[model samples]
Target: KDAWEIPRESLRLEVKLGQGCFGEVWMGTWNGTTRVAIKTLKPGTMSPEAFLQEAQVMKKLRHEKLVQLYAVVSEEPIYIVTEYMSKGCLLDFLKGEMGKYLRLPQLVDMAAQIASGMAYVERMNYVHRDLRAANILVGENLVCKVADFGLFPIKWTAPEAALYGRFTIKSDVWSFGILLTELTTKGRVPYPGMVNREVLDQVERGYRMPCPPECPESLHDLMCQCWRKDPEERPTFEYLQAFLEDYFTSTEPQYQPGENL
Candidate 1:
């Protein structure tokens, strides 16, 4: 069956979970029981056809790093319900609640999961237009699920995409470098104090943000590799995962794949 068609009547939307230019999301229930995260579209805000198409793509993608799409509502007040992440967005979790206490191994684990997920996307030839920590949902045990595709972020956005709306796997690599800045610094603003246009200019001029403290020099270099002006110059997610996992396993002494942090 194409992504299970869920009845809108079965969903009970509660408090406003979040909102953006695309639409509003709600913490809700499926069949009045299962906790779910629902994205409701504002009329004229998104093309339902385009959304369902993207939803299908998400549904087909099966990976621990990617958020699972549970169901879709094609009727009025259309919604795309996904698994409800308990801890919420990663950006807030890193900076607001428990930023300092997290160990290097834990952060390395989170980055590994993200890269693993992106590797799956890379294999499928899908490019995540918005690959920031804000789009990464944090669940119990630090399981990072990549979320919020299609609604591209304007800031720290890729250079090609910023200039001519060119988003590709390579562009995603560029965005990941910016994301690394956030992950390591615990949500410090990318290109702090710089507006969207300025970030675009500075990034194009080889002005990448410096890494924060506690970051390994190698990981910092990884970010720089991802930010190379030529998209082709950037490494693939599969390779990135291998390199990150090598660091994780080599240093972690009795490492386990998929260990929740």
Candidate 2:
């Protein structure tokens, strides 16, 4: 089998890096050598069939910007072994004290990388269903990789997805726009200070968040295009990747902090 069927004893889960209603993820080691992340899906949280399906999808979906699935333990509860991203989730990274020091060029670079990963997923005909800052992991050198596939987030979800459960590549594009807002605003929650119901109501009625402060006009323009009411009207992740790549290179790019170390 192409997928590695990891034995439970092979993984040693250590620090609890993340805890949520979905499940707990831990910093783990594979055979006491290779550092990895283990996403624990408690028994009953998901059917074995569902977990297997996710493993099947992840093993085949490999890209530099996408998290690498190392193996899976299909036992009591489930363990998904993935490469450890040292810096943790992007949302927290952007909200931390260091986030205050980051500027536009760096933000654009991150967006470009995410788009590149999404572009690959699009070409593979896989819908990420969930795409948001919280699902993006940052590693050394601030390298960000798309991680965690999911049900969906209300604020970060596309209008069509939220209302009709229509999740397409275009819907993912819509979420990407919200992610851009998160990056530009240094991790400000989408629809900041608004209730989920109000946010949903407003979004259904065609209200998109205004441009984030200090966000590039061109980037904001792209965000607006992503939030287009008609899914067909949204740009493809391929286009977004190209656009952000060009935008990042064309501008006077800034060096990432702590790059020398």
User: Quick one: best lDDT, which candidate?
Assistant: 2
Residue-by-residue lDDT tens digits, candidate 1, 1-261:
354897667899987986866788889889988899888878777777866776777777878789998888876567888899988988989898688766667787788889888998999888888888888999898899888744436666778888888899888888788887787777888777988877777777888878666566678889889988887989999888887778864644554433122
- Write down the lDDT that model 1 would get: 0.80
Write down the TM-score of every candidate: 0.85, 0.87
Error of 1 at 183 (Å): 0.8
lDDT of 2 at 246: 86
What is the C-alpha local distance difference test score of candidate 2? 0.85
Q: Which pairs clash (backbone N, Cα, C closer than 3 Å) in model 1?
A: none
Error of 2 at 31 (Å): 2.6
